[PDB]
Amino acid sequence: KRVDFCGKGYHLMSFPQSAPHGVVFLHVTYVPAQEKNFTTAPAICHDGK
């Protein structure tokens, strides 16, 4: 859950692999795109509630 620890973006899972004198991690991330604008509001009034 801590951000920017394993991979850039939201983190899903990972795989380790060996190396001559170390380890190599493959991280799977998740990156959104194709945004819009829309229009918001904090709450909705109805019958004074």
Binding site: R2, V3, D4, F5
Partner: protein, 50 residues
């Protein structure tokens, strides 16, 4: 006959510099760990919520 005497100055200065280099290495090996923590704290307490 004085080259022997100069050999004492050379080996004194060399040791004086040897101590400085080692002191620098030992001291600079700490700033690395002190800044790695700052980098860790900045990427999670600023870019997100802890």
């Amino acid at each position: 006959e004085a080259e022997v005497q100069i050999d004492r100055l050379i080996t004194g200065r060399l040791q004086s510099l040897q101590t400085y280099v080692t002191q620098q290495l030992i001291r600079a090996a700490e700033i690395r760990a002190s800044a790695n923590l700052a980098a860790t704290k900045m990427s999670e307490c600023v870019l997100g919520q802890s």
